[PDB]
Amino acid sequence: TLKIAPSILAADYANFASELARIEETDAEYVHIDIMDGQFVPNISFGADVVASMRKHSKLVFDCHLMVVDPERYVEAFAQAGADIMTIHTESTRHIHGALQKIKAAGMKAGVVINPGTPATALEPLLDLVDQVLIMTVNPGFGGQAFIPECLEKVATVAKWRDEKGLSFDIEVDGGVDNKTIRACYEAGANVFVAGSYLFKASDLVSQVQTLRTAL
Amino acid sequence: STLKIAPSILAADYANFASELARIEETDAEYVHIDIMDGQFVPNISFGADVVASMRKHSKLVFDCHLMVVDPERYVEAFAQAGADIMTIHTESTRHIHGALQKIKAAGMKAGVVINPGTPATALEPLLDLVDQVLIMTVNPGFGGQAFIPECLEKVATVAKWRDEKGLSFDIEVDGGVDNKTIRACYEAGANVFVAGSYLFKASDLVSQVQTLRTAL
Amino acid sequence: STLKIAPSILAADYANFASELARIEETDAEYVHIDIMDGQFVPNISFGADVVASMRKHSKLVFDCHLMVVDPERYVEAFAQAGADIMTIHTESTRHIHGALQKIKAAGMKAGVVINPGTPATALEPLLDLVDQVLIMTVNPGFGGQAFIPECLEKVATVAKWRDEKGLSFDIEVDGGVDNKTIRACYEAGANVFVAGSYLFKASDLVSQVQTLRTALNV
Amino acid sequence: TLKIAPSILAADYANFASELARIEETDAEYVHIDIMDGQFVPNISFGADVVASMRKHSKLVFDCHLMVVDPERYVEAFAQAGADIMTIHTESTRHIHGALQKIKAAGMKAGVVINPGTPATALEPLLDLVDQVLIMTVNPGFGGQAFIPECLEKVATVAKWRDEKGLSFDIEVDGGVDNKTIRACYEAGANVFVAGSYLFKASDLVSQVQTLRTALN
Amino acid sequence: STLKIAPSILAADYANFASELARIEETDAEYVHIDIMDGQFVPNISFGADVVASMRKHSKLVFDCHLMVVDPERYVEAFAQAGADIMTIHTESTRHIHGALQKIKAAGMKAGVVINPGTPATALEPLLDLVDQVLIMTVNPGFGGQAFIPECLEKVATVAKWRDEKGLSFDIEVDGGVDNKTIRACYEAGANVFVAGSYLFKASDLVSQVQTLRTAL
Amino acid sequence: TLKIAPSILAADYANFASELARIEETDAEYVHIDIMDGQFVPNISFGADVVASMRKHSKLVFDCHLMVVDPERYVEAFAQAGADIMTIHTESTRHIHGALQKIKAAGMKAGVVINPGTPATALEPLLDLVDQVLIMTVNPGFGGQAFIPECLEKVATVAKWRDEKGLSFDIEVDGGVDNKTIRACYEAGANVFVAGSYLFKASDLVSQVQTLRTAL
């Protein structure tokens, strides 16, 4: 099924609890949480203890995206913080396969993500292991960036592979997703759509999420 | 020479920074200590510049930002833009602590320098003339609730003495394990700014809990 | 293509390397697989070149050195002098895998290249013409006793296919979770060199234990 | 259009001005400038300020090749130094796509390069935004190295991809390119040829460059 | 006050750690000095915790582990389980030497701190209260058979003085270039624990070779 | 004896040959060469091969200052390039002592330098080993920066130690040294003065170096 995942990176950091409540008013089923350490990407967003704090105020799926170097050192912390899905970059560790096994052994769903410049082939050795494949549609680091349509080719490629192997993991897109681009993402083969800046620039979060469902 | 209390937001409810900041403004505290951690200088990641920027519009207190991150100089503009009033950086986090401090000052913020418990006081000697604040960690950086390290007070006395000899006037701050039973010693050692997280936020009545510190002094 | 067994000393009794090597020599194993770990490429530190140098006098077998260390090129000369016969390095451990392999050959050693489970077989393509051995990890590097990763055999087939297309003849090795129940599958996929640690050394009679692999190979 | 790009790394560093003049005497349209930081490769060559100083002594295309880690931090410096082309390594950053965008956004032509051991696949997601694809024919680091013919396989695969995508970026080769190897580079699909030692070992640069064009036939 | 001899297993026969440990137990040496090198803090890799663990059952002596590795804190648990009795770490190997020492003690082992030849004795002052041993390198870490560095004795003296003034009782160890001709000066400087590698293992009779040190003392 | 060391970092890079010629026309005895790798400091200047080509164009003392991480890997390279003195930062390696021994074993004069923020205590165990101690008077990176007076307190500390130990190494200063600041540097105890922007900003280099000789 098609899932909408509002990115909390675009919300009011001084009131996470009320922002989480606003999201739960919509029909979105996921909350996308961007962890940035200043190493993998230039800036620092927030870490596991912040996620743990958010956990107590939400019943949605915590879709954690780790834009940090050496993510395996945080598997235990995110499991304790209540992360439902942990998505890590093939570019952030020399042992992506083992890192993914670690996530699953910890009881969470395992997600793998690749940057716009990383070839889809970096995903092939991991298909039989992951629960989600995230294709970045903007270069990681911040919200409000321009959608990169070329990345949709990798979405198609992975969807084709999933079929050929008879696998069933979700395919997510993240970056520049809005009412004008989400349709292209769906057609390419994605079923999970992350949206930050677009959704949070509206006061009526419920209607904004609906503009995406309608665009679909 | 005035005594200031700096509640550490790291020990507060992260899901409600706004109300937590409002609680602090109810007390007589003049500073809000903000711990920035990047998973590199210390094991964990707390929050960054954009979170500070969000907090900024819900507080009129002094934003005493403490950067427990590697190569802090790259974040000077970000925190200036975020509304940080003081930027305190670790001598252990860069090979160019002097220039880094100059960058903070030129950016319009007050410059603070901090050293870990294992770092000798002499690491601060070459920086005395350019800082507005010297922070002596009294616990090993990383998290709250750790045991106070008395030996670190020797360094507070040492810096206070250097401040006098050179006739300087920067504030001397302590951070970690600061509570009603340890704050007096910090004061006697020569510190005038006291950061406190766990001891304060574990209490429901913050204004009252902050007063226990004032009284203890 | 000669089928070879390479007991991994990582699973042996570190307090008696000479003795353990003697036990290997009683078997029909042709290689001794030596895992060098530096605490950077993988979490643990095993042993270095000087330890390999000390083991050299107590064995007549092929020293198949596997470097799970960052920037392996800095150790080429050390291992050559320690007596390593094959030096196998990770594509993930250096930005210059091609040059690193050239350096191993220039030092008079056989050059091997290895890729982790999560690394695509294409990482191997530009290196086929220069190596003497291709190692496909069948467990994520780090330690023994791990579960075999079947999907990795897909990469063994792919490389064997490429080797055939280019008319090359390098050995194809597998390492990790190789035992009597998985070794045949490694063979059928295209491998001819099998590294085994925990499965072999958990047995007091190394000779019969190595034979069980030979039998499982059924070839 | 076939272009020759003399590599200044093989020239008299004590006289860049005169060496650049010697190049302008030939019919070479590019000046290949290798930037090395001692990290991506073992040696340090020269940086942006050197290129900036060279700028006014040449009217040719400054084809800058960055053999440094985290090249994005230098985009602005090279743009301001007068670089015409900025070619960066897929192996030098975890965000090659964004780095290329930064280059283009700064007004320079964007080039991407891969080492002999890096598969051509690393290039696929970047074909749309580059003005040049450089296939190293020697392991980066220094001149006089032996040509690696296997790398030409990647020159052909990219040429094919370019054709299949209706794209039109140049394809460059660099390393061990001489009068005996250039023809093969061309037949493989390359149209821009970097040459260091083969050209500068000669006293008559104009004649030496001509031997290369003659070799192309 | 108690003079102890610590043969360094780095100079022994690696292919026979068990028999080498037995040879040591034939002497009156009370410590086995175990050098852990990771190729990062120093150029070479020696052996790790698993090798130490394997050695544990073959010796009843004190395992005096010296970690020449970066970020040693990550190995405290491993060495504790390996049977290490003493864990000595370099101030130059972590930004949090104080907490690192605390972690060693919290794991049930004796905590030691060491400084390279080029590191000033003042780096030890903040740590005098929590250590059980202070190791002063008398050669630059990396390997054995190096030339003794007399100058380092000044730091042994400085620390023996501080121990006196503070009334502490930690051991003072020296390591590197210690033989029958240098051990005396080490002792005079204030050291009581002497690590010896090449000078001891170069002899067939380990029992009498250790005696030459006792007599030299 | 007092020495003047013009910094080639401030010269015209496209004509190193002619620039060195200008320096040789003055009575300056050293040519200060700043090696930057983009790691120790943010920029890259030039390496050992550049120095190598500079060697035959000068009979002066090549005083190479390495603002690079892990300088020991370059000892052999600079010894071959013709460096006469090799000065390294205590903040650039965990083994400053052995690094200095290496420089001497290589047949070069060993020099050690500390950043403005680095305490003089860092030099304490290195005095018996060096031929030169350099105290930065500006934060390393580039020329034209403001002189940092407080650093002279360190020039004085080392001078004092030198005497108490009866050693005879040179004491150099670098950064912000001009006709106005050089006098203080001398009174602080330094005897070797590096100057870049102040010297090269003038067409008559011979007289500019004399303005420093006079100010002394």
Ligand SMILES: O=P(O)(O)OC[C@@H](O)[C@H](O)[C@@H](O)CO
């Ligand atoms: O592109 P928009 O939807 O504004 O931003 C989305 C971001 O929040 C995204 O999740 C983040 O990983 C980008 O680095």
Ligand SMILES: O=P(O)(O)OC[C@@H](O)[C@H](O)[C@@H](O)CO
């Ligand atoms: O007051 P306690 O709970 O000891 O500590 C407070 C922390 O928030 C402290 O400011 C932080 O820098 C520790 O890394």
Ligand SMILES: O=P(O)(O)OC[C@@H](O)[C@H](O)[C@@H](O)CO
């Ligand atoms: O999987 P088993 O055969 O038990 O272990 C084998 C290991 O010793 C293997 O060689 C090593 O490279 C793993 O990092």
Ligand SMILES: O=P(O)(O)OC[C@@H](O)[C@H](O)[C@@H](O)CO
């Ligand atoms: O191989 P030759 O033409 O001599 O040298 C060419 C080099 O100067 C090349 O540009 C450089 O990027 C190699 O690292």
Ligand SMILES: O=P(O)(O)OC[C@@H](O)[C@H](O)[C@@H](O)CO
């Ligand atoms: O006693 P010598 O042979 O000088 O050295 C012995 C070594 O084993 C020493 O303990 C080691 O820490 C040096 O890095």
Ligand SMILES: O=P(O)(O)OC[C@@H](O)[C@H](O)[C@@H](O)CO
């Ligand atoms: O003399 P000024 O222009 O201040 O400085 C000259 C510089 O070239 C200096 O030598 C350099 O080490 C700064 O990093």
Ligand SMILES: [Zn+2]
């Ligand atoms: Zn995301």
Ligand SMILES: [Zn+2]
């Ligand atoms: Zn703090």
Ligand SMILES: [Zn+2]
């Ligand atoms: Zn192996």
Ligand SMILES: [Zn+2]
């Ligand atoms: Zn080039």
Ligand SMILES: [Zn+2]
């Ligand atoms: Zn030791």
Ligand SMILES: [Zn+2]
């Ligand atoms: Zn300099």
